[PDB]
Amino acid sequence: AFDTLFDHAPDKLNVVKKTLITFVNKHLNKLNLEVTELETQFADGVYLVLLMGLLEGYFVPLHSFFLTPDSFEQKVLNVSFAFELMQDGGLEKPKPRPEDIVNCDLKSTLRVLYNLFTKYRNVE
Amino acid sequence: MNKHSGIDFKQLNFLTKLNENHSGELWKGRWQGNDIVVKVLKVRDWSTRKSRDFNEECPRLRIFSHPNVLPVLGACQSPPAPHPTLITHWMPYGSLYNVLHEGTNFVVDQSQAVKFALDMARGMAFLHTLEPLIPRHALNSRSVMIDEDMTARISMADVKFSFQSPGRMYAPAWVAPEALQKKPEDTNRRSADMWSFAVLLWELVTREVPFADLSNMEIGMKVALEGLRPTIPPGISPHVSKLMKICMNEDPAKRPKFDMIVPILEKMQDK
Ligand SMILES: C#Cc1cccc(Nc2ncnc3cc(OCCOC)c(OCCOC)cc23)c1
């Protein structure tokens, strides 16, 4: 379904990407964080964790994840933890493995971001 | 046989639903001649391990020996109950938060505010005598309740349980900077609670919600990493300013103990 928005309407795909860009900055700019590139800026899990707290109304204690991950393994742990926060919030288990996000799979990343966007468009 | 069977869920009279959120549901009800609040907990991936843990954690909350501590009357074990459930007494004025910030009918005066402060300091000093400390108890204005005679009481029913996510913190404005960043086992938990009391003092002085204009994420990140602090209120006595500054010392080890500020607050009472 989302795969058709991805592959066989590449000017819709870019509009999906431009939609997801506006959405994440609406929230992350509150922390003075800017996203200009969806292909890489969520790969280390940090912005996904911060975004979840912004969307669902909590702070994430800094000992709960790696704010400055120093390894592929720590980035996988961050993404897995963000996936758990997603499930805490009512989303079903995400399809991609956490390593798919760490490896900058644009489809895996936009799928996760799109499911967040479908659920949370209207949060101020 | 088990040492506690807990409260029988079948004996609860559920009267009216008060609230529902991420953590569960609150109901007003009745049980064995008591007017109660029931909290039905929402838990993902409930398990026998988590249920065993719930049943070991709840007995510590049944504290009947201090006027400024509100006990959990008991808990429903799940199984056999549908969900892990807590029972406490209905407090007619609700939380301190509601009395200070959502009080549509009266504004408590500053003599009452100073009495609330003394009440809370006495209850915290008592809780800090327990060995070990009750874990996962966060002091803030939502976790203090106001009883029928306006006595403030620390709510034991508002503790967090081991199976509730430690990664989601919903009242960071009251949390000490070190506790936003370090695991509990790496902090002095008593000194962290004194920071929370300092923020309660600020709230009693300003009658404002701390950092009300910011999201919980913004609050935690800015307090932890950008040095955001409550602004010391203008036009208060040097004595109140001094107390609030020492309770909010950046160095946890320099903050007073609750049993040190109890006599200070006693002298601040009208009576
Ligand atoms: C078990 C348990 C448990 C766990 C966590 C929190 C609480 N909360 C409370 N506990 C005790 N008494 C309460 C009384 C309350 O209202 C009293 C009337 O206020 C004017 C009250 O209001 C909640 C909002 O209702 C719309 C909450 C109370 C109970």
CA of B36 to the centre of ligand 1 (A): 9
Asked whether the CA dihedral A71, A72, A76, A78 is positive or negative, the reply is positive
Q: Kind of pairing, strands B69-70 and B152-155?
A: parallel
Burial class (CB in 10 A: 0-12, 13-18, 19+), B64: exposed
* Domain residue limits, chain A: 1-124
The contacts of residue B141 (CB under 8 Å, 6+ apart) are B95, B96, B97, B100, B101, B174, B200, B203
Task: Tell me if B170 and A57 make a contact (CB, 8 A cut-off).
Answer: yes
DSSP class of residue B91?
-
Contact B171, B138 (CB under 8 A): yes
Contact B190, B181 (CB under 8 A): no
CA B100 → CA A65, B142, B197, B244, B269, distances in Å? 35, 10, 15, 18, 19
Q: Give the chain B residue whose CA is nearest to the CA of A50.
A: B217
Residue B35's φ and ψ, nearest 5 degrees, are -85, 120
| Residue B152 parent element (H or E) | strand B152-155
Pocket test for ligand 1, best of B7, B9, B15, B18 (most atoms within 8 A of CB): B18
| Contact B18 CB / ligand 1 (< 6 Å) | yes
Task: Give me the CATH code for the B4-90 domain, please.
Answer: 3.30.200.20
Elucidation technique: X-ray
Q: What is the position in ligand 1's atom list of the atom closest to the CA of B91?
A: 12
Task: Tell me if A61 and B216 make a contact (CB, 8 A cut-off).
Answer: no
Q: Residues of B at the annotated binding site for Mg(2+)?
A: 158
Cα A56–Cα B250–Cα A51 angle in degrees, nearest 5: 15
Q: Kind of pairing, strands B69-70 and B34-41?
A: unpaired
Residues of B in contact with A56 (CB under 8 A): 22, 168
Residues of B with CB under 8 A from a CB of A: 22, 44, 165-170, 172, 179-183, 186, 215-221, 224
Task: Say how far residue B71 (Cα) sits from the centre of its chain.
Answer: 12
CA distance B27 to B16: 6
Looking at the DSSP assignment, which residues form a beta bridge with residue B41?
A: B24
The contacts of residue B94 (CB under 8 Å, 6+ apart) are B145, B146
CA distance B3 to B6: 9
Burial class (CB in 10 A: 0-12, 13-18, 19+), A50: buried
Q: How many CB atoms lie within 10 A of CB B104?
A: 5
Nearest one of B207, B200, B67 to B125, comparing CA atoms: B67
CA B22 → CA A117, B19, B126, B169, distances in Å? 20, 10, 31, 12
CA distance A114 to A112: 5
Query: Radius of gyration (Cα) for chain B, nearest Å?
Result: 19
Contact B28, B37 (CB under 8 A): yes
Residues of B in contact with A26 (CB under 8 A): none
Nearest one of B164, B159, B144 to B69, comparing CA atoms: B144
Task: Give me the CATH code for the B92-270 domain, please.
Answer: 1.10.510.10
Task: Tell me if B169 and A63 make a contact (CB, 8 A cut-off).
Answer: no
The correct answer on CATH 1.10.3720.10 for the domain covering A1-124 is no
